[PDB]
Design a protein around this ligand. Structure first.
Ligand SMILES: CCCCCCCC/C=C/CCCCCCCC(=O)O[C@@H](COC(=O)CCCCCCCCCCCCCCC)COP(=O)([O-])OCC[N+](C)(C)C
Ligand SMILES: CCCCCCCC/C=C/CCCCCCCC(=O)O[C@@H](COC(=O)CCCCCCCCCCCCCCC)COP(=O)([O-])OCC[N+](C)(C)C
Ligand SMILES: CCCCCCCC/C=C\CCCCCCCC(=O)O[C@@H](COC(=O)CCCCCCCCCCCCCCC)COP(=O)([O-])OCC[N+](C)(C)C
Ligand SMILES: CCCCCCCC/C=C\CCCCCCCC(=O)O[C@@H](COC(=O)CCCCCCCCCCCCCCC)COP(=O)([O-])OCC[N+](C)(C)C
Ligand SMILES: CCCCCCCC/C=C\CCCCCCCC(=O)O[C@@H](COC(=O)CCCCCCCCCCCCCCC)COP(=O)([O-])OCC[N+](C)(C)C
Ligand SMILES: CCCCCCCC/C=C\CCCCCCCC(=O)O[C@@H](COC(=O)CCCCCCCCCCCCCCC)COP(=O)([O-])OCC[N+](C)(C)C
Ligand SMILES: CC(C)CCC[C@@H](C)[C@H]1CC[C@H]2[C@@H]3CC=C4C[C@@H](O)CC[C@]4(C)[C@H]3CC[C@]12C
Ligand SMILES: CC(C)CCC[C@@H](C)[C@H]1CC[C@H]2[C@@H]3CC=C4C[C@@H](O)CC[C@]4(C)[C@H]3CC[C@]12C
Ligand SMILES: *[C@@H]1O[C@H](CO)[C@@H](O)[C@H](O)[C@H]1NC(C)=O
Ligand SMILES: *[C@@H]1O[C@H](CO)[C@@H](O)[C@H](O)[C@H]1NC(C)=O
Lengths: 577, 577
């Protein structure tokens, strides 16, 4: 069905080159002026050669058109809903610029740079005909959705001049011609024409030239995307933070769900396995992040540039685990229950690799910058040390799951001590935030706080060791002692979430970077709430089923990739070192 | 043996991407500052990933070392002789900078970016094990030849500083550490180490990342070479012109012959066909042009930068036909004569294609710039028109070679009229140069000159039609009427070469760009001398053989690719348009 084993190397390639571009950008290896030359090559030479080659050899007799217009209908619905509420809820003075750029932001995926290698990895050896749908949807979506936005931004541009009847021909033709000036649209126009002229075959004198210019698009576009991302996050207020969450949620969540529903409604027919594979491919298409062209478009308009640029550089990072989690969730009903446990173990192993490397970087940054002596930052350093042992414990646990009983007990004790320590360390950080906000001075001892965070989980692990039962022959780490282990994880998560939730709500009612400290506490609380519910689900219901498998998978991701979320918040920060 | 059919698409890719980079550079699309970012990307991310990937998977038990050290011995001999005569003949004030940079220029090929696709095209489907010798020879050559040059350039820097006992450890260690700072050398060290560490297998999590970063090296590297080549030729005097000719001749002529001779002397054994293929691969390896890294090194040393940069951009342009001609000359002994004629026709067709496109460009540049009204350019526009008719006539003759007798006769008449006009237009241009040099005013009429140049070849064609015989069932155009056609081509070439040779020698003894006009006349005179000798060879000797095939091939190349030489001399010029 789907080669879900070879998706994680593709997500390593597509974001490791982006990380290389970002590292080269901050390092001062390639400045902003020099990054413009790399973008000029990619956007004028490599991308047109790639589009022209792949549409000359494209077979229009093979393409299932039902799938094609279902994906566009899904994208049209997302565009339709985002434009309507942007018109209702925004201020009249800038209602048109947002209504023309926000639905473009929520619909235009990064298909050619990020989407094509991921689809290529999952679908080359099983359904090789699904790769041509990338080159079909992205330019068709450009011609049929982008002109509608450009009229709205040009209407906002008419407002500043504030004269004449705006001469309605003059405005809609600029948006249509702005679309046609994109290199993607007319190279697709030339490729469709040359598909019938050359009879679906590239000339032999030109075949190698187009391959050499087209195969250089992938690595250089991801590198330039990483160079684009340097320092463009800026600071945003609550009203821009909230609209950014709403837009990125729209692009990465409700567009893929709309794609699945419209494909099952409109692409009717075919065999069941083909229908299921088409549905799975439809979910994967909507998860792709926003193309960097939208930030370019807001730049040329000089309208809502900060929000759209921040939205693009955030969505590319945020979509990296969403592709992985969503695709592995789709292959779960197709799998037998017994090798499903190996699938859960494989996902946690691949996540713990990325989480451990990012945690080493963030721990090194916090240690070398000597910021750990600061009052908010001491508790963060213990937390990051604890999260690193979790990821390293999964590396051990994957290879010793069927090993000797004594080694398994030691690995389980170490792994669950670090997991339980992570749970209460979120609450300790929240209590420290409440202490820095109100009740000036008379701060609690950091050593006593560290002793509680290091001792209470150890006491819980000892109680689970004393009162727990032996055996536990399972491939998953969460099932080794039985109901005693799940009761201990439920009590630790419920006490920590209630303590941190009270301290976080009390902080709002009441360099010392309290602006970002809170969000690292905030994103973990949603994780502890999902951790508590699965422990509650197992005790009250002993039957796995319709969502226990999905909830157990989500328990694995927020346990062994919490360092990734912490690194994204903390590690990418400017220091002296 | 060798897939010589698919070499010309590889040379089309490898020089079309270079031409695209040069066009983007001159167009002002990518300036010098912006080209630095693309070069930073290529040289710091794409090339190290390519070297590391291709050396991790390399099989050291498969490599024939005899070929490897034969190629290195040939390069060492070229380095030794160039250093020796650079030490003997140069001025004492700057003998060391030239002696350290000229043999690097004459030994260091551009074998990654340009060499790897050509070797891949000629040797993927027949002898796929020959591709690893590219990644083997260039870094070993770097480590074993570059430090000697860096000692010489650091001796020249000590000379300029002029103090102390020059502390020979300090200098030979600067040269060695300058060698070790190259990205190629230590990435090859890491790849050799990881070949034994990883047991000759790339890890699966890193395989796709290394493929994505390595597959983007070729096109972006050729593009950056083209951006590097913009406007760096400059002007040079007689001595620098002569030393440039000597250096590029050394790199592109005597290094491949030394490679062939040392491979047949040192790589003893194997089968006969394997020995012949190894010899052909050694010649193809030696034809590769100079890397732009030599110009980078001359820039960082700040000595002989103009000479080395001009040498690199000239060797890169000049090597494009030398690879094609040499490789098609090597496969001729392995071919029967009857499809050797088809091989000659295919070479002439591919050359006439490139010559026609470059001639269309140069004719458009000369027409739009309105420089054809100038005194020397009127004969040049007619000459370029005539050479375009030659190339289009070869295109027709290639496609109508087995067609009706009347169309073949018309095509032959048109082709040989245009060829004889090209022959005599060199002499008319030389006579015009002599008229513009001495005997001021009283210039000859341009209309009478055009009438002479268009009628005498038409009269010769009419005489060959009247006195020639019918039939001529041959695939080559040069054999249609028999000895009458070869006598007419010999008389036209001998009269034109003698008239142009007398006028060119009289010009030296005696914007109006007389500096470049002469060289276009000069490069054609060597062609007319080679054209005359093959006509003389056929009349005095009626037996084809040991060099008649090679001389007929060279007649084919200089008949249907003279437009390429003319475009390389004239078309790449700054105008107003
Ligand atoms: C996961 C394993 C499997 C996949 C394989 C992954 C491959 C591994 C590869 C990884 C490399 C990643 C590629 C991008 C390069 C990093 C740089 C970057 O983005 O910088 C940008 C920052 O970006 C942010 O600020 C990100 C915002 C999100 C942070 C929280 C993530 C929560 C995810 C939860 C999602 C739901 C979870 C799932 C639920 C279903 C811009 O940088 P800047 O402008 O300099 O700003 C920083 C400086 N400043 C802050 C001081 C201003
Ligand atoms: C041939 C068909 C088969 C192969 C396929 C080929 C693929 C086809 C692809 C072709 C594209 C070529 C790729 C290079 C890019 C072009 C631009 C370029 O280099 O310009 C450079 C100039 O370069 C020169 O000055 C050239 C010097 C040589 C000219 C004479 C050639 C004679 C060859 C005879 C050899 C022996 C013949 C054979 C005997 C065995 C840089 O320009 P610039 O720096 O601005 O300087 C110029 C301006 N200025 C003068 C005003 C200062
Ligand atoms: C249910 C939520 C639906 C709708 C509720 C939306 C409420 C947003 C309120 C933000 C604050 C405010 O008052 O507006 C400020 C922000 O400026 C705007 O008003 C622009 C926001 C445009 C719409 C948001 C984009 C996502 C659309 C929906 C995406 C749905 C998918 C995601 C959710 C499933 C005023 O700006 P100013 O600078 O003060 O002037
Ligand atoms: C296998 C799965 C892999 C998953 C990877 C993805 C997940 C991991 C994700 C992320 C981890 C790394 C995040 C780095 C991003 C921040 C960089 C930064 O801010 O720039 C820094 C500079 O740059 C350096 O100092 C670079 C350090 C060397 C490269 C280390 C990255 C290793 C990536 C992993 C390789 C592991 C090995 C993998 C193979 C076993 C700081 O500089 P500054 O002070 O801001 O400014 C510079 C000063 N100046 C401007 C004055 C000059
Ligand atoms: C199949 C075999 C193919 C073999 C091809 C390889 C051999 C052919 C070789 C050479 C062909 C031509 C080379 C031109 C190089 C000079 C450019 C130059 O000087 O810059 C020009 C600008 O740029 C332009 O105007 C570019 C012209 C369009 C691109 C070239 C089209 C033809 C290329 C091939 C199509 C092949 C089609 C194949 C498919 C059928 C002039 O600019 P300027 O004013 O002088 O100076 C700049 C100053 N300014 C910035 C202020 C303006
Ligand atoms: C037989 C030919 C061999 C040898 C005869 C060489 C005669 C060159 C004379 C040039 C003019 C002169 O007097 O020197 C000037 C140039 O400066 C030099 O002298 C530097 C030239 C170094 C040697 C040339 C490189 C090729 C070596 C051989 C490559 C052999 C392979 C190619 C040929 C088969 C003085 O410079 P200035 O600035 O006046 O001070
Ligand atoms: C649930 C999935 C499918 C949809 C994606 C929504 C979530 C995960 C995304 C969308 C909006 C995102 C936030 C938007 C902006 C910022 C500010 C940045 O400085 C830190 C990360 C942070 C706080 C992001 C974290 C992840 C986030 C909350
Ligand atoms: C014979 C082969 C194998 C070796 C290569 C030697 C010949 C073809 C090369 C080497 C030196 C070259 C010349 C060096 C410098 C220039 C100046 C430039 O503005 C026009 C071209 C011109 C005049 C080159 C023409 C081609 C050239 C004569
Ligand atoms: C999908 O296509 C047809 C649908 O009838 C059928 O061969 C099968 O279900 C699938 N085939 C392939 C090759 O995927
Ligand atoms: C070259 O290698 C051996 C030489 O003994 C022989 O198989 C043949 O000549 C050649 N084989 C291949 C595969 O090239």
């Amino acid at each position: 069905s789907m080669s879900i084993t070879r998706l994680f190397p593709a997500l390593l390639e597509c974001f490791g080159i982006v990380l290389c571009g970002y590292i080269a950008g901050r390092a001062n290896v390639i400045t902003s002026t020099q990054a413009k030359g790399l973008g000029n090559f990619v956007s004028r030479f490599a991308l047109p050669a790639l589009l022209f080659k792949n549409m000359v050899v494209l077979n229009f007799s093979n393409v299932d058109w039902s799938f094609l217009y279902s994906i566009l209908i899904a994208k049209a619905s997302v565009f339709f809903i985002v434009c309507v509420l942007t018109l209702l809820v925004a201020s009249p003075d800038s209602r048109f610029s947002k209504a023309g750029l926000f639905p473009i932001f929520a619909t235009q995926s990064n298909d050619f740079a990020l989407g094509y290698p991921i689809v290529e990895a999952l679908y080359q050896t099983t359904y090789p005909e699904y790769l041509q749908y990338i080159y079909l949807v992205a330019p068709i979506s450009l011609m049929m959705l982008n002109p509608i936005g450009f009229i709205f931004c040009e209407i906002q541009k008419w407002k500043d001049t504030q004269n004449a009847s705006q001469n309605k021909i003059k405005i809609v033709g600029l948006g249509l011609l702005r679309v046609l000036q994109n290199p993607i649209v007319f190279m697709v126009f030339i490729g469709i024409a040359f598909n019938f002229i050359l009879d679906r075959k590239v000339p032999v004198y030109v075949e190698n030239f187009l391959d050499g210019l087209g195969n250089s698009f992938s690595g250089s576009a991801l590198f330039y995307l990483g160079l684009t991302m340097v320092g463009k996050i800026k600071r945003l207020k609550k009203s821009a933070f909230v609209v950014l969450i709403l837009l990125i949620t729209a692009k990465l969540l409700v567009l893929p769900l709309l794609c699945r529903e419209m494909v099952e409604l409109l692409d009717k027919g075919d065999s069941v396995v083909n229908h299921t594979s088409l549905s799975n491919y439809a979910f994967l298409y909507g998860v792709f992040p926003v193309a960097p062209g939208v930030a370019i478009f807001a730049t040329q308009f000089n309208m809502e540039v900060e929000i759209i640029t921040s939205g693009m550089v955030i969505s590319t990072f945020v979509s990296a685990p969403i592709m992985y989690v969503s695709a592995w969730l789709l292959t779960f009903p197709t799998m037998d229950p017994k090798p499903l446990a190996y699938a859960i173990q494989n996902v946690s192993f691949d996540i713990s690799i990325v989480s451990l490397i990012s945690l080493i970087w963030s721990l090194a940054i916090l240690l070398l910058s000597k910021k750990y002596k600061q009052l908010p930052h001491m508790l963060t350093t213990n937390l990051l040390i604890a999260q690193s042992i979790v990821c390293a414990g999964m590396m051990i646990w994957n290879f010793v799951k069927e090993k000797n009983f004594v080694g398994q007990i030691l690995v389980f004790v170490l792994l669950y001590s670090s997991l339980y320590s992570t749970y209460l360390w979120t609450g300790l950080l929240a209590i420290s935030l409440f202490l820095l906000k109100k009740r000036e001075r008379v701060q609690i001892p950091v050593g006593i706080i560290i002793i509680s965070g290091w001792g209470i989980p150890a006491l819980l692990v000892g109680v689970l060791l004393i009162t727990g039962k032996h055996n536990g022959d399972s491939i998953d780490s969460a099932f080794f002692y039985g109901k005693e282990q799940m009761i201990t994880t439920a009590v630790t998560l419920f006490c920590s979430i209630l303590i941190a939730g009270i301290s976080l709500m009390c902080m709002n009612q009441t360099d010392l970077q309290l602006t970002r400290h809170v969000l690292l506490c905030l994103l973990l609380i949603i994780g502890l709430f999902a951790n508590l519910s699965s422990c509650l689900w197992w005790l009250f219901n002993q039957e796995p089923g319709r969502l226990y498998v999905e909830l157990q998978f989500f328990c694995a991701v927020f346990n062994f990739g919490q360092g990734f979320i912490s690194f994204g918040i903390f590690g990418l920060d400017k220091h002296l070192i």
